[PDB]
Amino acid sequence: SVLAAANPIYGRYDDLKSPGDNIDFQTTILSRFDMIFIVKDDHNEERDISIANHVINIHTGNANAMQNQQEENGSEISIEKMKRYITYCRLKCAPRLSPQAAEKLSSNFVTIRKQLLINELESTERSSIPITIRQLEAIIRITESLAKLELSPIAQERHVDEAIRLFQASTMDAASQDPIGGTSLSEIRRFEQELKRRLPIGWSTSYQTLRREFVDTHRFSQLALDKALYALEKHETIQLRHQGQNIYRS
Amino acid sequence: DYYLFLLRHSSLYDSFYYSNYVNAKLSLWNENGKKRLHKMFARMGIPLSTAQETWLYMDHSIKRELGIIFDKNLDRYGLQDIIRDGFVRTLGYRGSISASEFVEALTALLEVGNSAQKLTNLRKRWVSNFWLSWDALDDRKVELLNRGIQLAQDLQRAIFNTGVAILEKKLIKHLRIYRLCVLQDGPDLDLYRNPLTLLRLGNWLIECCAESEDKQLLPMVLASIDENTDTYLVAGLTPRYPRGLDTIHTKKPILNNFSMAFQQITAETDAKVRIDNFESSIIEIRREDLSPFLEKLTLSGL
Known about the structure:
Chain A is built from 10 helices and 3 strands, in the order ααααααααβααββ.
């Protein structure tokens, strides 16, 4: 099994730049990998305070005590015991699937494949991170490993849900991470003009009414939904409450 | 036998290094002590790499000649008081043990083994450790004694590491009547919640202070912290004469007035203390209440 560490071009990911020209790996090499995680840096000063606290604690003056309690309270096991347990589990158990899990995996794969096609037809370029039958085999292997952890001779929905969750995380973090890469913008400014004009601060309107109005006009549904959720992404005058019905203007 | 720390279970070098009497007599906390120890070894003639080996595998010839080597080398440096006569117990082919090593193992196993609620939990753990030490007495169990020996080595290492830091930082404040020292912060402070561990640390400090050129016999007050409870565990300690002194100046052992002073101050002021330990010179005091209390102890008749 291969565990690889890499850095993107231009150091930081530079999300303003397109995903296509941020990764220099071809499609062939990426397909063999099946768990790719993008570790982006962030700044909110709270995670930063927590990390600073953790490092100042993890200096040798303090951790040498605290970590010891982890073997005294039963929270963590030593490395050698973990090695023995993992080799024992590797030798002994080898789980198997069940038809309900197979149906769930099939439906999930169809869903993600259709979502990839949906992104591709809009972006009008090939995806930099592909989704293939290799990925279905990958989810199957993840489920089998999850069942293998507890020595279960059969794999069930409990492990399948966790495997699907991990795959969805590793998919939405890298592949479906802003697929647009940033009618053109002419309708965007036109659409920004009307909502400022027709909807003042403090009042609200139903989503159905606006969708009907701007499908009756030239904007159509494809342009409106993206514009609506990006005006939300701007997050300085548009707020959603009460499910997807109440379009509140903050 | 000799005043040495686990001589028959650790290397001779580690024994000389961790022996409290030699530490006090040679000032091993700074580099000059280590230089003098290497002088000791070079003049005795034992190779350093040989003396850093286990007592079982250490050379038979020098094992036989150790007594003569000590008798001929230790006179120059004033360590000739380390030689004494002790009891050795041998049963079967398991080996040989001594009373000093046995009591050190027992004490260490008592120390380490396995608000009001956590105090009760600590006292229950101490009771369980007492039971484990009691069970370890029988000759049918030796995995409950090897563990005690290794725990004794670890605890002595920790005590030495804390004491050298205390001595170099000079936290010992010298007042007009008694010396004072408080452990505000540091590593592994959670170990010193045990009164016997605190007494061991205080005994080493008392030996180090007594083996000095000062001509003042003053009691020593030591305090610790446990952040979960936010209380100070304070123990009062009596001064001790050097072990190498005649019996003429031993008319009566030094008395301990700390319990009387504590009970008088508690009976005259409403401090939030809890005096319940069987040893009357060990009390628990609050962090906010320590300083005024100390002042009272300064201004009261001892």
